[PDB]
């Protein structure tokens, strides 16, 4: 799938080590979903680690067209479903296995460099 991004619309404070506090108006990076109820969003601004945030506390959008999926109803299991299905977003389990196997020793490419923007 493509590097989709989600934006928090409500302040969701973490509860356990498997949860990450978020605020309304923040930028999070989606990694996977869970039964179309929970979404795996990570911090983009600050630096800490991946957590867990419900779809009812986030808004699926696109860095290319954030105004396209800005009207969508994440709450509606139907809408969120078509989105996750269309974009072909991986699930939590799939994400865990992917990262686990990806971290292991295998073929890869050293070439490649990425960085974060910075203005004002």
């Amino acid at each position: 799938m493509a590097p989709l991004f989600a934006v928090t619309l409500y302040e969701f404070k973490a509860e356990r080590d498997d949860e990450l506090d978020v605020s309304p108006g923040e930028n999070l990076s989606i990694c996977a979903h869970y039964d179309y109820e929970w979404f795996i969003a990570k911090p983009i601004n600050r630096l800490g680690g991946p957590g867990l945030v419900p779809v009812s506390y986030v808004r699926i959008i696109d860095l290319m067209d954030p105004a396209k999926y800005a009207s969508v109803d994440t709450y509606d299991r139907e809408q969120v479903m078509k989105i996750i299905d269309e974009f072909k977003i991986p699930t939590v389990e799939q994400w865990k296995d992917q990262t686990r196997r990806y971290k292991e020793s295998s073929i890869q490419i050293g070439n490649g460099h990425g960085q974060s923007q910075g203005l004002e």
């Binding site: 869970y34 109820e37 929970w38 991946p50 867990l52 419900p54 779809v55 009812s56 939590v92 865990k96």
Partner: peptide, 16 residues
């Protein structure tokens, strides 16, 4: 994985 959200799915701010 440590990412098993077995918790319930919360609803949006509305009068159900």
């Amino acid at each position: 994985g440590k990412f098993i959200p077995s918790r319930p799915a919360p609803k949006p701010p509305s009068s159900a």
